[PDB]
Amino acid sequence: IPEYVDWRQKGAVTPVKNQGSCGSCWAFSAVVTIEGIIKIRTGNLNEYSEQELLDCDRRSYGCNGGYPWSALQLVAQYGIHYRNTYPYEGVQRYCRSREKGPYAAKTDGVRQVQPYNEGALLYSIANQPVSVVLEAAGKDFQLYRGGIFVGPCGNKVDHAVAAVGYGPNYILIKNSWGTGWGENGYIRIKRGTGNSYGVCGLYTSSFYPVKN
Numbered sequence: 001i002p003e004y005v006d007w008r009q010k011g012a013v014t015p016v017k018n019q020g021s022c023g024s025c026w027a028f029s030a031v032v033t034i035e036g037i038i039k040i041r042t043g044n045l046n047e048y049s050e051q052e053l054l055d056c057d058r059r060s061y062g063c064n065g066g067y068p069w070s071a072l073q074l075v076a077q078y079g080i081h082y083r084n085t086y087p088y089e090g091v092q093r094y095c096r097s098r099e100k101g102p103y104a105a106k107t108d109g110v111r112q113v114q115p116y117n118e119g120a121l122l123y124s125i126a127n128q129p130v131s132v133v134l135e136a137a138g139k140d141f142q143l144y145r146g147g148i149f150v151g152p153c154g155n156k157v158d159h160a161v162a163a164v165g166y167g168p169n170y171i172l173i174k175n176s177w178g179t180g181w182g183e184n185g186y187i188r189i190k191r192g193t194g195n196s197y198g199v200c201g202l203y204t205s206s207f208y209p210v211k212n
């Protein structure tokens, strides 16, 4: 795998979104990985519906949090609508998948990256954007403005985001806090520190969709 990966330069990443006050990060992270795998496999970059996962993922808890893996498994079992068809409202509502016509895209499954393994996560990023989790509660992460982030942070992961690239000393992360946070909505998190958890627990729980 190459020294640098940046799925933004390969046209596989849509604009940065803002989840608002709703605890929907798990759905945004999952959606980032779906947009990426659909672009990689079909050549077209589309925006898909975070709201659909918020409403319809019966295993997750709407705005009270959820699981990127349940969201990816929902997209693999049923499918997902375009963001236009099922726009983001920032609040959990009734599942409206049947009333919005056929799904726009569908995947074939979900694979987990081997946790606590930097190379395994890098390998999965070299193939596609990956859903990852991290500890975002610390002021230092919340206030991140730019540069390669080294912390301080613990490993008590609480926030799902998406890894869309990496470099020799960092992993490139798409957050869902709007374009005004970090590096136009992105953060570069130091890697290669030898801590098995990853900086901010970045290697705790990583999933990506599979689409043949």
Ligand SMILES: *[C@@H](C(=O)O)[C@H](O)C(=O)N[C@@H](CC(C)C)C(=O)NCCCCNC(N)=[NH2+]
Residues within 6 Å of the ligand: 019, 022, 023, 024, 025, 026, 061, 064, 065, 066, 067, 068, 133, 134, 157, 158, 159, 160
């Ligand atoms: C993330 C966010 O929107 O910032 C959101 O709070 C979230 O999904 N958190 C996850 C943490 C994982 C690392 C993704 C979470 O807490 N998931 C489990 C959901 C269960 C909590 N809620 C209820 N009602 N039981």
